[PDB]
Structure formats: structure tokens, C-alpha cells
Design a protein around this ligand. Structure first.
Ligand code: MVO
Ligand code: MVO
Ligand code: MG
Ligand code: MG
Ligand code: MG
Ligand code: MG
Lengths: 5, 236, 236, 5
């Protein structure tokens, strides 16, 4: 899964 | 609410203790209580709120994905019928997740966003609004799925418009917003080209503004820029 | 109880799904429902029950220790008075922990232990009884602390007596019981010599019986023997 | 902390 903050 | 009798400062103190103890459900409940006191949140307090709910919903999303995969496998050809249990339990987790999202959206709507006038606070809350509609979109399958997606898009777009006008390209809030909106494009809106363009342009404009920063600000901005690069690498 | 309307088999199925999803609170609730159907548990089902509650209480114990350390530091000379919040939140976590322990003890007393006639089931449940009294002892400070400690000791001792009569020295239940009773001696009963003696004797008697085992049984027994060795290394 | 199972 892609990075989110 | 169960936190109505506790002092605002005590709720904030306990949210910090809960974080140290990795008790994120407690942390979120404390921060919900703190928001419901009705005063605006400082930067530190906004961070506590976001960390708490990110961790709670993060866990629910991971569980949902495990269960959804098992359910998908159960519906393939040659799979033995095992009854309604997998769907039921996925639904249970899903409903809990939606509940948390609705709780956060509710805090934002009553009344964090409307009281947030400074760019840093307003963009932060609008990003959160986009994020929690995105989580709702991840699990949506009904009549309102398009409207849920559009609600995420609209919140992110308003945040982007303010961020571009009011914040430098290295501002960590501006960067984190762009990171997440880019993921929205890739995973939710079926727009990988928009996702890639946003991530690239955000990275490059940040790169060009690093020269203006202190060492500590440089550290903060470059961390998020690396996340943008990580996603670009995943996608290209 | 909220699980009263769900089929026993469906509760067991969902406990397994919850484990896969790392949803240990759900797993425990499902297994509590399954126990409350009133039928005895198979080996696999006993394992599900133990795994669920071990993980829930494990998390609570870790949080309790974080909070207790902060509280201890707050009571040192030169520490600034920060009000009742740390004690309150440690108490909150503590009360939740005690609640879970009481729930498990309740399942064991009503009526798992009394229906368990085979050595493997009876020893397993009596070990659990010792374990959950040990967790209560970890946080106990009042009039009943000695009685709580003695309740753990008594449950472990009954389990040990049966295990020594009825099970081979490599049996994983016998080994795990001895491991945990040894920790009880070291951490709860202020008896490090008894802890070390038990761990050593258990290890050595198991070593001498490995020759009787299949490859798969050997794997199971040696894993726990290594835990005994790890503790001995910590303690000597 | 010591190992238990
Ligand atoms: C009040 C405020 O200004 N909050 C923003 C902080 C900026 C620094 N920061 C981070 O870089 C991490 N989290 C994060 C960044 C950006 C947004 Cl919009 C939300 C959260 C800290 C954890 O690792 C990821 C970046 C904390 C928040
Ligand atoms: C029904 C039954 O016989 N259960 C015992 C199993 C023996 C094998 N096993 C383990 O070795 C582990 N857990 C564990 C061992 C002993 C006891 Cl008394 C309780 C639990 C598996 C996880 O790693 C530690 C050993 C599973 C239970
Ligand atoms: Mg649903
Ligand atoms: Mg553009
Ligand atoms: Mg107490
Ligand atoms: Mg002896």
C-alpha cells in the first residue's frame, strides 16, 4: 500500500 | 459524553499518556472529549487528534483488507461454501470503521473546520476530512459511492487551493496533503496519471524551496518528500 | 450475552478469522461466546481461547507497565507535581485488566475446569487459572494480595501434580506450565531459587525424553525447552 | 521480561 500521513 | 466531566487539560495529558502506552482507542476517546469542550485546538493538539484516529482507523482498514481478501477467495470457482460468517464479520469490521470515520467527520463538521481561520489549521482539518471520506470510499459499494468519493475530492481540493495560496511548497502540511490527495487519485479516483503528476510536481517544487530552510525544517520537509518519491517509485 | 444468538460453530469460525485479522478483542469475545454454549472445548478450541485472552491481557499488561513507570517517576524527589491524571489513567487500565482476568477466571470456574477430566484439558485450564491470578497479582497492592498470590500458586500446583503423574516430560502442556510456574516463582513469589530449580529440572527431564519423539513432536517440545533455557540465561 | 506461553 502507498504512503500517507 | 463520557468525557464531559473531565478537564480539557486532563484529557490532553491523558491522550499523551495513552500515546506512550500505545492505547490509541483511549487516545482517540480523550481527544474527542477535548474537541467537544468547544475551544479551538493548538497545533500540538491537532496532531494528537490526528495520530489517535489514524492509528485506530489504520488498524480497522488493515483488518478489513484481510477479511475482504478471504471473502473474495470464498467467491472464486471451486471454493467450498462456508456460510455467511466471513461476510458477516467483514461487515462487522466495516460498520465499526464507518462509525469511526463518521465520528471524526462529525468533529470536523461540529465545529472544527468552521472555526479554523488560519491556513495551517484549516488545511490540516480539510485534509483530515478528505482522508476520512477516502476511508469511507475504500469500503463503499452502494448508491452513494460516487458522492462519498466526491466529498473526499472536494475537501482535498479546498485544502489544496488554500495551501497553494498561503503556505510555502516545503510546508509539511502542504506536503502531507499533496501526498494523500495523490494517493486518493491513484487508489480511489482511478486517476494514476493525476496521482503521479501531483506527486512529481509537489516533490520538485519542494526541492526548489529547501534552500530557505533551517536544518530542523529541512529534516521535516525531506521526510515527507521521501514518501512522495517512495510512491512515485511504486507507481512508475 | 451478545453472542448468545450465534451458533457455536460460527463463533469458532469467526474467532479464527479474528486471529487472522489480529482482532484479539473480537477473538476473545467470540471464544467467550463459544465457552458459554456449555459444551467442552476441543484442543484446537482451548488454544483459540488461550491465544485470544493472552493477546488482550498481554497488551493491557504492557500498557500498565508503561503507565506504572511514569507514575513511579512522578513520585521521585525533584519531580514536578502534575496532578492525579497519571494515577487515574493507570487505575483505568488496571481496572480493565482486572476485568478481563475476572472474565477468564469466571469461564474457568463456570464451568470449564469442573468438566475437564482428561489430563491434557484439566492441566491446560488449571495453568490458565494460575496465569490469570498471576496477572491479578502483578497489579495487586491491597488486603487480598497474599490470597491472590496463593490462588495462583494453588492452581499451578494442582496442574503440576496432574502433569507429573499423567504426561511425559516432553509434553508441551507440561513444559509450558512449568515455564510459567517458574516465572511465577521468580516474579511473584520472590523465590528465584525455586524458579531456577524448576526450569532446570524441567529442561533436563525433557532432554532425556526427546529420543521417544517424532520430528514434529521434537520441534514442539524443543521450542518450549528453548524458552526455559532463555529464562535460565536471564536469571543466572 | 521472562518468557511465558
Ligand atoms: C500542527 C501542525 O503543524 N502539524 C503538522 C506536523 C508537521 C510535521 N509532522 C510530520 O511531518 C509527520 N506527520 C504529518 C505530516 C503532515 C500532515 Cl498534514 C499530517 C501529519 C510526522 C509523522 O511522520 C509523518 C510526517 C507532524 C505534523
Ligand atoms: C490443546 C493443546 O494440546 N494445546 C497445547 C498446544 C501445544 C503446542 N503449542 C505451543 O507449543 C505454543 N503454545 C503453548 C504451549 C503450551 C501451553 Cl500450556 C500453552 C500454549 C505455541 C505458541 O508458541 C508457544 C508454544 C500450542 C498449544
Ligand atoms: Mg456494509
Ligand atoms: Mg496541477
Ligand atoms: Mg486499583
Ligand atoms: Mg521439585
Amino acid at each position: 500500500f502507498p504512503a500517507t500521513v | 459524553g463520557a468525557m464531559g466531566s473531565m478537564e480539557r487539560a486532563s484529557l490532553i495529558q491523558k491522550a499523551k499518556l495513552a500515546e506512550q502506552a500505545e492505547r490509541y482507542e483511549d487516545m482517540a476517546a480523550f481527544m474527542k472529549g477535548a474537541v467537544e469542550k468547544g475551544e479551538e485546538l493548538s497545533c500540538e493538539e491537532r496532531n494528537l487528534l490526528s495520530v489517535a484516529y489514524k492509528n485506530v482507523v489504520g488498524g480497522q482498514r488493515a483488518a478489513w483488507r484481510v477479511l475482504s481478501s478471504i471473502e473474495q477467495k470464498s467467491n472464486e470457482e471451486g471454493s467450498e461454501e462456508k456460510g455467511p460468517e466471513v461476510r458477516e464479520y467483514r461487515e462487522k469490521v466495516e460498520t465499526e470503521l464507518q462509525g469511526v470515520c463518521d465520528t471524526v467527520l462529525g468533529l470536523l463538521d461540529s465545529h472544527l473546520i468552521k472555526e479554523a481561520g488560519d491556513a495551517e489549521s484549516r488545511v490540516f482539518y480539510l485534509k483530515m476530512k478528505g482522508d476520512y471520506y477516502r476511508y469511507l470510499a475504500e469500503v463503499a459499494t452502494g448508491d452513494d459511492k460516487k458522492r462519498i468519493i466526491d466529498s473526499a475530492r472536494s475537501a482535498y481540493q479546498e485544502a489544496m487551493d488554500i495551501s497553494k495560496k498561503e503556505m510555502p511548497p516545503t510546508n509539511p502540511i502542504r506536503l502531507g496533503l499533496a501526498l494523500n490527495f495523490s494517493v486518493f487519485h491513484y487508489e480511489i479516483a482511478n486517476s494514476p496519471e493525476e496521482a503521479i503528476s501531483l506527486a512529481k510536481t509537489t516533490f520538485d517544487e519542494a526541492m526548489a524551496d529547501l534552500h530557505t530552510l533551517s536544518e530542523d525544517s529541512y529534516k521535516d520537509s525531506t521526510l515527507i518528500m521521501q514518501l512522495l518519491r517512495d510512491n512515485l517509485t511504486l507507481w512508475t
